[PDB]
Amino acid sequence: TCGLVRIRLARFGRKNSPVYNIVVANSRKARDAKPIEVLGTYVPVPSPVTKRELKRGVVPIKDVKLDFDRTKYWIGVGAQPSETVTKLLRKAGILNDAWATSKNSNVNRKVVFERMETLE
Amino acid sequence: ASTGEIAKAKLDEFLIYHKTDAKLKPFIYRPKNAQILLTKDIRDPKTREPLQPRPPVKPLSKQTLNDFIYSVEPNSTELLDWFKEWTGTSIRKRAIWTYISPIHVQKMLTASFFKIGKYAHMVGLLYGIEHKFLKAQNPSVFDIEHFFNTNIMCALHRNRLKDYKDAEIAQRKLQVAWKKVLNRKNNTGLANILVATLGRQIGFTPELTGLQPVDISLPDIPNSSSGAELKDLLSKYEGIYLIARTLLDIDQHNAQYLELQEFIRQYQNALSESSDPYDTHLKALGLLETP
Amino acid sequence: STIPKPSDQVPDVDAFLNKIGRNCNELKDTFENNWNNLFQWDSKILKEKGVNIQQRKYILKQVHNYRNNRPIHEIKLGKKSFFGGERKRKAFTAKWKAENKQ
Amino acid sequence: SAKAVKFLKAQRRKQKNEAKQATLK
RNA sequence: UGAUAAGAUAAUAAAUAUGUGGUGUAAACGUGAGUAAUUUUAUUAGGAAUUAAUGAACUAUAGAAUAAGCUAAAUACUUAAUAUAUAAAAAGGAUAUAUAAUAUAUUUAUCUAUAGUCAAGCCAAUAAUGGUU
RNA sequence: ACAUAUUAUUAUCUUAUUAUUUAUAUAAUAUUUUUUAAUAAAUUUAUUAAUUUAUAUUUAUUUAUAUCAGAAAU
Ligand SMILES: [K+]
Ligand SMILES: [K+]
Ligand SMILES: [K+]
Ligand SMILES: [Mg+2]
Ligand SMILES: [Mg+2]
Ligand SMILES: [Mg+2]
Ligand SMILES: [Mg+2]
Ligand SMILES: [Mg+2]
Ligand SMILES: [Mg+2]
Ligand SMILES: [Mg+2]
Ligand SMILES: [Mg+2]
Ligand SMILES: [Mg+2]
Ligand SMILES: [Mg+2]
Ligand SMILES: [Mg+2]
Numbered sequence: 001t002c003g004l005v006r007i008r009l010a011r012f013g014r015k016n017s018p019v020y021n022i023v024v025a026n027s028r029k030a031r032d033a034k035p036i037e038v039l040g041t042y043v044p045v046p047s048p049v050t051k052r053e054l055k056r057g058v059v060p061i062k063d064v065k066l067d068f069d070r071t072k073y074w075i076g077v078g079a080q081p082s083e084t085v086t087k088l089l090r091k092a093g094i095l096n097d098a099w100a101t102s103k104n105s106n107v108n109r110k111v112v113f114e115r116m117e118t119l120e
Numbered sequence: 121a122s123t124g125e126i127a128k129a130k131l132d133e134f135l136i137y138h139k140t141d142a143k144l145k146p147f148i149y150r151p152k153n154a155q156i157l158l159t160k161d162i163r164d165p166k167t168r169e170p171l172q173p174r175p176p177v178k179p180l181s182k183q184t185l186n187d188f189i190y191s192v193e194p195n196s197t198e199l200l201d202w203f204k205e206w207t208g209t210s211i212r213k214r215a216i217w218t219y220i221s222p223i224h225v226q227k228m229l230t231a232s233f234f235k236i237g238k239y240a241h242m243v244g245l246l247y248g249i250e251h252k253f254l255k256a257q258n259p260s261v262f263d264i265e266h267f268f269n270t271n272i273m274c275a276l277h278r279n280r281l282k283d284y285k286d287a288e289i290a291q292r293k294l295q296v297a298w299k300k301v302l303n304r305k306n307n308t309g310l311a312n313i314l315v316a317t318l319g320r321q322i323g324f325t326p327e328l329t330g331l332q333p334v335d336i337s338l339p340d341i342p343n344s345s346s347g348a349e350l351k352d353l354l355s356k357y358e359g360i361y362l363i364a365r366t367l368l369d370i371d372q373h374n375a376q377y378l379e380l381q382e383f384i385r386q387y388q389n390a391l392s393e394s395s396d397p398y399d400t401h402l403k404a405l406g407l408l409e410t411p
Numbered sequence: 412s413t414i415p416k417p418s419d420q421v422p423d424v425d426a427f428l429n430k431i432g433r434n435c436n437e438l439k440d441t442f443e444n445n446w447n448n449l450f451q452w453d454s455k456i457l458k459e460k461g462v463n464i465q466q467r468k469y470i471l472k473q474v475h476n477y478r479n480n481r482p483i484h485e486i487k488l489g490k491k492s493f494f495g496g497e498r499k500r501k502a503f504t505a506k507w508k509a510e511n512k513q
Numbered sequence: 514s515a516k517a518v519k520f521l522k523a524q525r526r527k528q529k530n531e532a533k534q535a536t537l538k
Numbered sequence: 539u540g541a542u543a544a545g546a547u548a549a550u551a552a553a554u555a556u557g558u559g560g561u562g563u564a565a566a567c568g569u570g571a572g573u574a575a576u577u578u579u580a581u582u583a584g585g586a587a588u589u590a591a592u593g594a595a596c597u598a599u600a601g602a603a604u605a606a607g608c609u610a611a612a613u614a615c616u617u618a619a620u621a622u623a624u625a626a627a628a629a630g631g632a633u634a635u636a637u638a639a640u641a642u643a644u645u646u647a648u649c650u651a652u653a654g655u656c657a658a659g660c661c662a663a664u665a666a667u668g669g670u671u
Numbered sequence: 672a673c674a675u676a677u678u679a680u681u682a683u684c685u686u687a688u689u690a691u692u693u694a695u696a697u698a699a700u701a702u703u704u705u706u707u708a709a710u711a712a713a714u715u716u717a718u719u720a721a722u723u724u725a726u727a728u729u730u731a732u733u734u735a736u737a738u739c740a741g742a743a744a745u
Contacts (some may be wrong), residue, residue, distance in 0.1 A: 003596035004656050026656070027595090028565050036656080077655040078597025137719095142608065146700065150720070156699070167512050176720050179711035200544075210610065215718080241544050248539080248546025275541095284541065296539065493556045497563085507556090515736065517682035524682090 001080045003027065007071075007089075008082040009042060010035065019043055022066060022085060024074050039074070040066035042088065059113075064088060093117075124191020127184045128202075135206065137177040138213045149176050179215075185224050186355075189231045194408060199228060200241055207249045217256035222266035222303075226359045229267075233274040234401035237408040243271065247300055259302040264311050266359060268301050272314040273363050276370045279321055281409065290322040298328045309334035310363050313380075317371045336379040338364070341390045354391055361387045365398040414450045415478050424449045431473045432485030435466060450474060 001008070006025060010032050013019035020042040023035035046060035071094060075081075081089060087104070089095040093115050100106075140148060144162065147153045154173040164171045192199045209216045225246065232242035250262055261267070275293070278284065294315070306312070312334060319326040338360065341353055364383050367374040374380060388396070421427045424442045427449065428435045441460050442448050449470075452460075457467040473483045495503040 004594080005596070030566065074655090076597080078595090079655075080596065143700090152721080153699075176709090177718095178709065178720085179718050181711065197544080204545080208610095212608080238544090240540060240542060242540095244540035244543085244545055251547075278541070282541065289541080293539090293541085300539095490555095514682070520682045 001027075001082050003078065003080040005036070005074070005077070005079045006082060007039065007074060007079050007085045009084055017045075022064075022088070024079055037070065037074075039071050040064060064092070066092065068092070068094065091115075122191065123187045127187040127191070130180060130184050131188060131202070131206075133174075133177055134180045134219075135209070135216065137174075138216050139209060144171075149174055151176065180219060182219070182221055182224070185219070186227055189224070189227050190235070192231065192236050194235060194404065195237055195411065197238065199232065199236055200238060200245060203228070203242075203245050203249075207245075207252060211252060211256040214257075217253070217258050220253075220258065220261050222261050222263050223356075223359070225261055226266040226270045229270045229274060230359070230362060230401070233277065233405070235404045235408075237411075239274055239278065247296075250300055250302070254302065261303075262301055263303040264301055264306050265308060268297060269308075269311050269314055269363055270359060271297050272311070272318055273366050276314070276317055276321060276366060277405070279318075280370065281405065285322055287322055287324040290318065291324050291326075294318060294326060295328070298331070304330055306331065306334045307337060308339075308360060309336045310338075310360065310367070313367055313374060313377065314363065317367060317374060320371055320373065336377060338379050338383040340383065341386050345390075350390060354387065357383075357387060358397055361397055362401065412478060414447055417446060421477070421483070427473075427477070427483070430483055430485065431469070433466070433469055433488070435470060438462060438466065438470075450478070 004027050006027050008023065008025060008031075009020040010023045010025070011018055011020055012032075021035075021038050022040040022042055024037045024039060025033070025035035029035070041064065043063050046062050049058045049060050066088075071089070075089075075094070081095075081099075083101075086095060086099050090097070090099060097105075137145070137149065147157045147160065147162075148171055151173060157171065157173055161170045188202070189199060206216065206220075211217060229239070229242060229246070233239040236242075246262075246267075253259060253261055272294070275290075279290070284290070312331060313336075315326045315328065315331065339357055341350070341357060344350075346353075360383065364380045364387075367380060368384075417423065421430060424444050424446060425436075425439050428439055428442070441457075441462060442452075454467055454471060457470070462470070476483050492500065494500050494507065
C-alpha cells in the first residue's frame with residue numbers, strides 16, 4: 001500500500017483472540033496508535049455453527065461493522081486500503097473487481113450466494 | 121629510440137591526455153600548477169604514488185601513426201593491440217576519434233597483410249568497430265579509395281597466395297566489404313577495375329549496388345622534382361601505386377587500360393632513385409608465407 | 412487441489428527440487444520421486460516427515476506456483492552487503508580500507 | 514573591547530534612567 | 539562477420555548490489571536526564587500577520603517531457619531551451635509491431651499546474667509543586 | 672575556618688569550529704579579453720602552454736564581531 005492516508009486494520013483484543021479496528025491512519029504512525037478515524041471493526045474468528053445447523057446448510061459468518069458512507073468518502077479522497085481491507089471492501093460491494101490482483105482474481109469460481117443487501 | 125618507439129610514446133601520451141579527467145587536466149599538464157598538484161596529493165589510480173606533473177600535450181601529427189604502423193614486427197599483435205585501446209576511448213573524446221584518417225586505415229590494412237601477417241584480425245577490428253566510428257561522427261574513414269580498394273587488393277593477393285577459388289565465399293565477403301563502406305565516393309575509378317578483377321580470379325560476376333561506372337582519373341604526379349613536397353606526394357599516392365601494380369600483376373586484362381601504366385611510369389620515375397614500394401611488400405609476404 | 416501434470420523442464424520431483432533450490436535437493440529421499448506426494452502432502456504431513464519450517468513453506472509456495480503455471484525458478488534470500496550491514500558498514504569499511512589499500 | 518563598550522553604553526543608559534526617576538519623583 | 543579465430547554485432551539463457559545510481563531510516567522503538575513554562579501541558583465552538591510560486595504523497599483532471607556538457611555510461615551531476623510580475627521543470631526503462639537508428643502500441647516511471655486529502659508555523663485567554671528565614 | 676565536588680556568571684584571558692564582515696594575491700578554474708610561441712590541419716583555422724583583460728565561482732592569508740570549551744575571579 002502507498003500514500004500518506006491508508007485504510008488498514010489495527011489490532012485489539014488479547015493474545016490468541018485478535019480483534020481489529022478498521023481505521024484511517026497516517027502511514028508513519030504506529031499500527032495501534034490513535035488513528036485519524038475508526039471506520040469499523042473486524043472479528044476474524046467465524047461464528048461456530050452447530051452440528052444440526054451444518055447439515056441444515058448454515059455457513060459460518062464473520063461479522064464486520066462498518067460505516068459505509070464514511071468509508072466511501074475516504075476512498076474518494078484517495079485513501080489507500082491495505083490488502084486485507086481491500087478484500088473486505090470488495091466483499092461488501094464498496095470496491096469492485098478493479099481492485100483485485102492476479103493472485104486472488106477469482107475469474108473462474110462458482111458463486112453459491114450472491115451479495116444481498118437487506119435491512120435488520 | 122627507434123622511429124616506431126618514439127611514435128608510440130607520442131601516441132600513448134596523446135591518449136593519456138585525452139583520457140584524463142577534465143577537472144584534473146589543468147593541474148597535471150599546466151606546468152604553472154605543479155605545486156598545486158603536489159599539495160592536493162591526488163593518488164594515481166592503481167593505488168600508485170601521487171600523480172606527478174606531465175609535459176603539456178600538443179596536437180599530434182597524422183604521420184606519427186604511419187611511423188608506428190610500419191615499425192611493427194613481422195608477426196606481432198602490437199598494431200592490433202594499439203587499435204583496440206585507441207578505439208576503446210569514449211566517443212565524446214573528439215580528438216581521439218578524429219585523428220584516424222582514411223590513409224591510416226589503408227596503411228593499417230596494407231601493413232597487416234604484407235608485413236605483420238595478421239590481416240584477418242585487422243579486418244575484424246575494423247569491421248567490428250565501424251559502428252563506433254559512426255556514433256563518433258567520423259564515418260569518412262570507411263571510404264572507397266582507402267578502405268574498399270585496399271581490402272579488395274589484399275583479397276586479390278590472398279586468393280592467389282592461398283589459392284581460394286570458392287565463388288560463394290568470395291561474393292559473400294565482397295558484399296560485406298561494400299556494405300561496410302560509409303563514404304561511397306568513387307573517384308579514381310580503380311574500384312570498378314578491382315571488383316572486376318576479383319570476379320575473373322574467382323570465376324564470379326560481381327554486382328554491387330551504387331558502384332556506378334567511373335572512368336580512370338589517376339592523379340599524375342608532375343615531372344617537377346621537389347623534396348618533402350614530392351616525398352609526401354609519393355607517400356600520398358602510395359596506396360594507388362600498390363593497386364595499379366597489383367591489378368596488372370594479378371590479371372593481364374588490366375593491361376588493356378593504359379592509364380594504369382602512365383601512373384606507374386610517373387610514380388616510379390618520380391623517385392625511381394629510391395626502392396620500389398610494390399616489390400618491398402611482395403618480398404615480405406613471402407618472408408611471412410615461409411613461417 | 413488437483414495434481415498438475417509433469418512437464419519437460421520439470422519431469423519428476425527430483426528435477427522440481429533442483430530448480431527451486433534453497434538446498435531443497437536434500438529432501439529427494441523424503442518424497443521418493445513420487446509426483447503425487449509432492450502435490451498432496453500439506454504442511455502437517457511435511458512436518459511429520461522432518462522437513463523444517465523454512466523449507467516446507469518454500470516447497471508449498473513453489474507447488475502452488477507450479478499448479479498455476481507460474482515460474483518456479485529459485486529466488487535467493489537476501490544477503491548483507493560485502494561491507495556489512497548498514498549499521499556496521501562505516502566501521503567495517505574503515506578497517507577494510509586500512510588493511511587493503513593503506 | 515566590544516563587550517566592555519557595550520557594557521558601558523548600557524550602564525550609562527541605566528544610570529540616566531535611574532536619575533530620570535529621581536527627577537520625576 | 540572475421541580465410542583462422544583474437545574480437546565485433548544481434549538473439550536467447552544466466553551471473554554481478556566489493557563500480558556509478560534510485561528509494562528507505564524527521565518514522566518507529568526505547569528512555570524520563572533536562573524541563574515550574576519568551577519555550578512544556580491542558581482547555582477554548584479563540585485569534586491574525588489577515589501564514590510561501592513549500593507537497594512531503596496519494597486521489598481527480600489537464601499539459602509537457604528540448605539541446606549540450608561531464609563520467610566508462612545513465613532515470614548521476616552541471617549549464618541552457620520552452621512551460622499558470624512573470625518566475626520556476628523533466629527521464630527514461632521493459633515488451634511487442636512496423637520501419638531504417640526511427641516510429642507507433644502496451645506497461646512502468648519523470649516534470650508542471652489546479653483542487654482535494656494528509657500535514658505544518660505563529661499568537662491570545664485560563665490552569666499547572668514548595669520556600670519570602 | 673575549612674578541604675572538596677557541582678553548577679552559574681563575567682567590562683577578564685585563551686579558544687576549536689562556524690557565521691558574518693574586511694583587505695590581499697602576479698592564487699586556481701570557466702568565459703571574455705591583448706598579444707605571444709609551439710603544434711596540427713588545410714592550403715587562414717583549430718588545439719595546447721603562456722601573457723593582457725574584465726566577469727562569475729572558489730582558494731589561501733588577513734581585519735572585525737559572535738561562538739563549544741578551558742583558565743581566572745565571584
Ligand atoms: K525496555
Ligand atoms: K524526566
Ligand atoms: K513510456
Ligand atoms: Mg509499491
Ligand atoms: Mg552499489
Ligand atoms: Mg524521532
Ligand atoms: Mg530528453
Ligand atoms: Mg546525455
Ligand atoms: Mg536528475
Ligand atoms: Mg537547470
Ligand atoms: Mg523559464
Ligand atoms: Mg532559619
Ligand atoms: Mg574569537
Ligand atoms: Mg559558554
